[PDB]
């Protein structure tokens, strides 16, 4: 869950509370992380 935080927090800084931004970020994050 530690890497999970980093992975999302990167996007939280780069693209804070968006729409498609979240979709891509979460998908791409889960694609790496597998949560």
- Residue 13 sits in which domain range? 2-33
CB 31 within 8 A of CB 4: no
Phi, psi of 32 (to 5 degrees): -80, -55
- The span from the CA of 33 to the CA of 4, in Å, is 7
> Rounded to whole angstroms, what are the CA distances from 28 to 6, 8, 9?
13, 10, 13
Which structural technique was applied?
Answer: NMR
Residue 34, both tokens: 């597998």
Contact present, 25 and 15 (Cβ < 8 Å): yes
Cβ contacts of 7 within 8 Å, gap of 6 or more: 29, 32, 33
Instruction: Please tell me the distance from the alpha carbon of residue 21 to that of residue 4, in angstroms, as a whole number.
Output: 17
Write out the two tokens for 13: 């800084």
Which residues precede gaps in the chain, with C-N > 2.5 A? none
Q: What is d(CA 18, CA 1) in angstroms, rounded to the nearest whole number?
A: 22
User: What total number of domains does the chain contain?
Assistant: 1
- Cα gap 32→16, rounded to integer Å: 20
């Amino acid at each position: 869950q530690k890497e999970t935080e980093i992975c999302r927090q990167w996007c939280q800084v780069m693209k804070p509370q968006g729409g498609e931004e979240q979709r891509r970020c979460q998908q791409e994050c889960e694609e790496r992380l597998r949560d």
